[PDB]
Design an enzyme around this catalytic site. Structure first.
Site, PDB file in Angstrom:
ATOM      1  N   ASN A  13     -13.233   3.627   4.763  1.00  0.00           N
ATOM      2  CA  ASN A  13     -13.910   2.795   3.775  1.00  0.00           C
ATOM      3  C   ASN A  13     -15.134   2.058   4.291  1.00  0.00           C
ATOM      4  O   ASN A  13     -15.560   1.085   3.673  1.00  0.00           O
ATOM      5  CB  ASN A  13     -12.945   1.805   3.147  1.00  0.00           C
ATOM      6  CG  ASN A  13     -11.722   2.473   2.611  1.00  0.00           C
ATOM      7  OD1 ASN A  13     -11.774   3.540   1.999  1.00  0.00           O
ATOM      8  ND2 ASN A  13     -10.605   1.863   2.848  1.00  0.00           N
TER       9      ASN A  13
ATOM     10  N   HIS B 181       0.804  -1.217   0.000  1.00  0.00           N
ATOM     11  CA  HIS B 181       0.000   0.000   0.000  1.00  0.00           C
ATOM     12  C   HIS B 181       0.831   1.258   0.000  1.00  0.00           C
ATOM     13  O   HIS B 181       0.509   2.216  -0.711  1.00  0.00           O
ATOM     14  CB  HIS B 181      -0.950   0.025   1.195  1.00  0.00           C
ATOM     15  CG  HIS B 181      -2.259  -0.622   0.916  1.00  0.00           C
ATOM     16  ND1 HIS B 181      -2.399  -1.936   0.556  1.00  0.00           N
ATOM     17  CD2 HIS B 181      -3.486  -0.066   0.796  1.00  0.00           C
ATOM     18  CE1 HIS B 181      -3.680  -2.206   0.339  1.00  0.00           C
ATOM     19  NE2 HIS B 181      -4.356  -1.071   0.448  1.00  0.00           N
TER      20      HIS B 181
HETATM   21  S1  LIG Z   1      -6.963   2.221   2.157  1.00  0.00           S
HETATM   22  O1  LIG Z   1      -6.240   1.211   1.330  1.00  0.00           O
HETATM   23  O2  LIG Z   1      -8.212   2.647   1.503  1.00  0.00           O
HETATM   24  C1  LIG Z   1      -6.801   1.727   3.745  1.00  0.00           C
HETATM   25  C2  LIG Z   1      -7.502   2.541   4.786  1.00  0.00           C
HETATM   26  C3  LIG Z   1      -7.625   3.910   4.789  1.00  0.00           C
HETATM   27  C4  LIG Z   1      -8.289   4.506   5.829  1.00  0.00           C
HETATM   28  C5  LIG Z   1      -8.908   3.907   6.837  1.00  0.00           C
HETATM   29  C6  LIG Z   1      -9.613   4.702   7.877  1.00  0.00           C
HETATM   30  C7  LIG Z   1      -9.618   6.022   7.875  1.00  0.00           C
HETATM   31  C8  LIG Z   1      -8.775   2.504   6.869  1.00  0.00           C
HETATM   32  C9  LIG Z   1      -8.082   1.845   5.860  1.00  0.00           C
END
Ligand SMILES: *S(=O)(=O)Cc1ccc(C=C)cc1
Ligand SMILES: [Ca+2]
Ligand SMILES: [Cl-]
Length: 269
Positions: free
Chosen positions: A153, A62
């Site tokens: 999400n 990521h």
């Molecule tokens: S992302 O890969 O979309 C991971 C992610 C981002 C944000 C949150 C909470 C704010 C949780 C996972």
């Protein structure tokens, strides 16, 4: 051959590039799972706050992906970031599993404020607040860092932390129709949105891959902030944040989209 992911075009980064704006001279920290060495990235430095993972290389994917949306190099290979000349820092606060602690995240924020970062990208969060984390967001902000964070999400009409905090710029995700992605959290504290579905970027193993999430939207805004800072070197975090919001394209209600779709052309005009 290089291609331009749809979201990079959607936020109108190429128009900024054509005016000579690339993010040169702007320090952007990616607080994530690390950033792997990759021929379409230039990683200037960083630090790890994950015990047992002392390298800043990415064992997850990521952080490398997020980094490429901000800053994939403008060349004859791969993809293209919003801010392809941003000075890119790997701040590992999440391990290979994709998780960390509020303490590691806070240490990354403090590192950003102690090392001259202009922007910190936090494609991470939780539905629950954290005093530790909040203190570090505020500290970084006091040191001139623009903290840009994913709304989350869950699909809910409230946003997760740290994006919810006043001193974070909260970013939700849109799709190719300029609708809110179903998963994108919204509501109070949402500042802006950006592309977050089918986002191709750099990936470990010297390759390219697509992901969905508010994590993918966030770096479009972090990159746009770097473009604005290059154009306006004297500006503060707050000035940059406000200008990005004021120049966004409305997509619908403030509850759902905040100021709307980030527009790097309008923000650098
Ligand atoms: S992302 O890969 O979309 C991971 C992610 C981002 C944000 C949150 C909470 C704010 C949780 C996972
Ligand atoms: Ca490239
Ligand atoms: Cl454009």
């Amino acid at each position: 051959a290089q291609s331009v992911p749809w979201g990079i075009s959607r936020v109108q980064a190429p128009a900024a590039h054509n005016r000579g704006l690339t993010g040169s001279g702007v320090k952007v920290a990616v607080l994530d799972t690390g950033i792997s060495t990759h021929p379409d990235l230039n990683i200037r430095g960083g630090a790890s706050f994950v015990p047992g993972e002392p390298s800043t290389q990415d064992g997850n994917g990521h952080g490398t992906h997020v980094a490429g949306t901000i800053a994939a190099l403008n060349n004859s290979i791969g993809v293209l970031g919003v801010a392809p000349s941003a000075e890119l820092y790997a701040v590992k606060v999440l391990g290979a599993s994709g998780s960390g602690s509020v303490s590691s995240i806070a240490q990354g924020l403090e590192w950003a404020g102690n090392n001259g970062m202009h922007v910190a990208n936090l494609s991470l969060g939780s539905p629950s607040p954290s005093a530790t984390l909040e203190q570090a967001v505020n500290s970084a902000t006091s040191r001139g860092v623009l903290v840009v964070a994913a709304s989350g999400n869950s699909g809910a009409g409230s946003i997760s932390y740290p994006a919810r905090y006043a001193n974070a710029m909260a970013v939700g995700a849109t799709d190719q129709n300029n609708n809110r992605a179903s998963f994108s959290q919204y509501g109070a504290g949402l500042d802006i949105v950006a592309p977050g579905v089918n986002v191709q970027s750099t990936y470990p193993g010297s390759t390219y891959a697509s992901l969905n999430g508010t994590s993918m939207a966030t770096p479009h805004v972090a990159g746009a902030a770097a473009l604005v800072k290059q154009k306006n070197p004297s500006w503060s975090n707050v000035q940059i944040r406000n200008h990005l919001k004021n120049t966004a394209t409305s997509l619908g209600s403030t509850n759902l989209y905040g100021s709307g779709l980030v527009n790097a052309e309008a923000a650098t005009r």
